[PDB]
């Protein structure tokens, strides 16, 4: 039903990637478009 | 790396390492650290054979 | 500098000189069609170029998600949205001039002020 | 007498063609014969460099930029001076002059090379002069069993050393 998707070693240059599920998704320990 | 937006020369972009060891890293800095280490290992493992030949 | 073709037969025209009337007459080597030349320019080597930073633009560059976005405006439509990206030429001496393309005015403009 | 008639006819042409007309045509041919008789004083039509100085002065007159060279050469700036001048860069005109000095400044800068500047501190001490002006620099050389080298160099005199 399409919730995950295989992406090969070749495609990624059409794709922006997020590190975390909320890294910028809403619009001392450590330091973190 | 494919994880930033296009055409940047920021210290994050090329990957100047911000943090110390103690607070941790980001995975990008982890990857660049592995890059520099692996370069050190390959240059050592070739230069040992070449220096052995020239010494003999 | 362009390469004209014989309209009767789509073949590469060559320059050849009139023997007495002193004019360049592009005669076809396939058929007998001939044509006088507009300029005495024939050949051009151009050993130095600096060109190629700009083109490759499609009408929907901004449809791709991977390009970054900024807030400098287009100086024709004044809309604050934009798409910016660097040179499309890659030599070892190409510049850090930037190219800014908008969606509203659909126009290309730069950030140089010399 | 081919050269001493040809250059005289050349100065006849480049003085009659002026907006400064010749009603003193006898004065202007006196100027022309003075120009040619100092012009020969370098060569006397016996040296190959005669035509070069003639080409310099001739096309400086016919340059336009500038036309004011005709006015200043007819109202002064005497012709035996203008063999010994060799002021071809200096005259006709001054905007092209200031262009040339900007070009020369740019070339003199760009022919200079690499000048990596070697940031210093007072943490260590030299061996030769024993000064704390250490041009330090840091890098790794050996195998995995150690950290960096602690490379050292003094910038006050030039003394390179190393710390253990
Ligand atoms: Zn034809
Ligand atoms: Zn606009
Ligand atoms: Zn010293």
UniProtKB/Swiss-Prot annotation, chain A:
Transmembrane segments: none annotated. It is found in: Nucleus. Component of the RNA polymerase II (Pol II) complex consisting of 12 subunits. Belongs to the RNA polymerase beta chain family. DNA-dependent RNA polymerase catalyzes the transcription of DNA into RNA using the four ribonucleoside triphosphates as substrates. Second largest component of RNA polymerases II which synthesizes mRNA precursors and many functional non-coding RNAs. Proposed to contribute to the polymerase catalytic activity and forms the polymerase active center together with the largest subunit. Pol II is the central component of the basal RNA polymerase II transcription machinery. The binding of ribonucleoside triphosphate to the RNA polymerase II transcribing complex probably involves a two-step mechanism. The initial binding seems to occur at the entry (E) site and involves a magnesium ion coordinated by three conserved aspartate residues of the two largest RNA Pol II subunits. This is DNA-directed RNA polymerase II subunit RPB2. The gene is RPB2.
Swiss-Prot record, chain B:
The tandem 7 residues repeats in the C-terminal domain (CTD) can be highly phosphorylated. The phosphorylation activates Pol II. Phosphorylation occurs mainly at residues 'Ser-2' and 'Ser-5' of the heptapeptide repeat. The phosphorylated form of Pol II appears to carry, on average, one phosphate per repeat. The phosphorylation state is believed to result from the balanced action of site-specific CTD kinases and phosphatases, and a 'CTD code' that specifies the position of Pol II within the transcription cycle has been proposed. It comes from the Eukaryota. Residues 27-39 are annotated as: Bridging helix. It is found in: Nucleus. Mutagenesis experiments demonstrate that the minimum viable CTD contains eight consensus Y-S-P-T-S-P-[A-S-N-G] heptapeptide repeats. Identical and simultaneous substitutions in a number of consecutive repeats are lethal: 'Ser-2' -> 'Ala-2' (14 repeats), 'Ser-5' -> 'Ala-5' (15 repeats), '2-Ser-Pro-Thr-Ser-5'-> '2-Ala-Pro-Thr-Ala-5' (10 repeats), 'Ser-2'-> 'Glu-2' (15 repeats), 'Ser-5' -> 'Glu-5' (12 repeats), '2-Ser-Pro-3' -> '2-Pro-Ser-3' (15 repeats) and 'Tyr-1' -> 'Phe-1' (12 repeats). The C-terminal domain (CTD) serves as a platform for assembly of factors that regulate transcription initiation, elongation, termination and mRNA processing. This is DNA-directed RNA polymerase II subunit RPB1.
UniProtKB/Swiss-Prot annotation, chain C:
Its main location: nucleus. Zn(2+) 2 binds at residues 74, 77, 102, 105. One of its GO terms (molecular function) is zinc ion binding. The modification Phosphoserine is found at residue 39. It comes from the Eukaryota. GO terms for biological process: maintenance of transcriptional fidelity during transcription elongation by RNA polymerase II; RNA-templated transcription; transcription by RNA polymerase II; transcription elongation by RNA polymerase II; transcription initiation at RNA polymerase II promoter; transcription-coupled nucleotide-excision repair. It is found in: Nucleus, Nucleolus. A zinc finger (TFIIS-type) spans 70-110. GO terms for cellular component: nucleolus; nucleus; RNA polymerase II, core complex. Zn(2+) 1 binds at residues 6, 9, 28, 31. Keywords: DNA damage, DNA repair, DNA-directed RNA polymerase, Metal-binding, Nucleus, Phosphoprotein, Transcription, Zinc, Zinc-finger. A zinc finger (C4-type) spans 6-31. The keyword tRNA processing does not apply. Pfam families: Zn_ribbon_RPB9, Zn_ribbon_TFIIS. The keyword S-adenosyl-L-methionine does not apply. PROSITE patterns: RNA_POL_M_15KD, ZF_TFIIS_1, ZF_TFIIS_2. Belongs to the archaeal RpoM/eukaryotic RPA12/RPB9/RPC11 RNA polymerase family. Present with 2440 molecules/cell in log phase SD medium. Component of the RNA polymerase II (Pol II) complex consisting of 12 subunits. This is DNA-directed RNA polymerase II subunit RPB9. It comes from Saccharomyces cerevisiae (strain ATCC 204508 / S288c) (Baker's yeast). The lineage of its organism: Eukaryota, Fungi, Dikarya, Ascomycota, Saccharomycotina.
From Swiss-Prot, chain D:
GO terms for molecular function: RNA polymerase II complex binding; RNA polymerase II complex recruiting activity; RNA polymerase II transcription regulatory region sequence-specific DNA binding; zinc ion binding. Residues 3-119 form the TFIIS central domain. A zinc finger (TFIIS-type) spans 122-162. Zn(2+) binds at residues 126, 129, 154, 157. GO terms for cellular component: nucleus. It comes from the Eukaryota. Belongs to the TFS-II family. This is Transcription elongation factor S-II. It comes from Saccharomyces cerevisiae (strain ATCC 204508 / S288c). The gene is DST1. The chain holds residues 146 to 309 of 309 of the full protein.
């Amino acid at each position: 039903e399409g919730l995950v998707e295989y992406i090969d070693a070749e495609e990624e240059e059409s794709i922006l990637i997020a590190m975390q599920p909320e890294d910028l998704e809403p619009a001392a320990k450590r330091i973190r478009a | 790396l494919p994880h930033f937006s296009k055409d940047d020369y920021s210290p994050e972009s090329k990957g100047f390492v911000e943090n110390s060891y103690l607070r941790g890293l980001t995975p990008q800095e982890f990857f660049f650290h592995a890059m520099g280490g692996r370069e050190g290992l390959i240059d050592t493992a070739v230069k040992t054979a070449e220096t052995g030949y020239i010494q003999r | 500098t362009t390469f004209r073709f014989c309209r009767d037969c789509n073949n590469m025209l060559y320059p050849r000189e009139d023997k007495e009337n002193n004019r360049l007459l592009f005669e076809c080597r396939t058929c007998s069609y001939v044509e006088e030349a507009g300029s005495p320019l024939v050949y051009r080597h151009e050993l130095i170029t600096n060109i190629g930073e700009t083109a490759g633009v499609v009408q929907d560059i901004g449809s791709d998600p991977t390009l970054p976005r900024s807030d400098r405006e287009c100086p024709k439509c004044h809309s604050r949205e934009n798409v910016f990206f660097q040179s499309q030429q890659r030599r070892k001496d190409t510049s850090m001039v930037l190219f800014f393309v908008c969606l509203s005015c659909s126009h290309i403009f730069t950030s140089d002020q010399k | 007498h081919k050269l001493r008639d040809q250059v005289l006819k050349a100065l006849y042409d480049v003085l009659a063609k002026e907006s400064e007309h010749p009603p003193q045509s006898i004065l202007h041919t006196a100027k022309a014969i003075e120009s040619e008789m100092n012009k020969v004083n370098n060569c006397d039509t016996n040296e190959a460099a005669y035509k070069a100085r003639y080409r310099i002065i001739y096309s400086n007159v016919i340059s336009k930029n500038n036309p004011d060279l005709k006015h200043k050469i007819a109202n002064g700036d005497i012709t035996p001076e203008f063999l010994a001048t060799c002021d071809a860069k200096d005259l006709a005109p001054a905007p092209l002059k200031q262009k040339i000095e900007e070009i020369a400044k740019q070339n003199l800068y760009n022919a200079q090379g690499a000048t990596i500047e070697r940031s210093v501190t007072d943490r260590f001490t030299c061996g030769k002069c024993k000064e704390k002006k250490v041009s330090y620099y840091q890098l790794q050389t050996r195998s995995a069993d150690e950290p960096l080298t602690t490379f050292c160099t003094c910038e006050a005199c030039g003394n390179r050393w190393k710390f253990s």
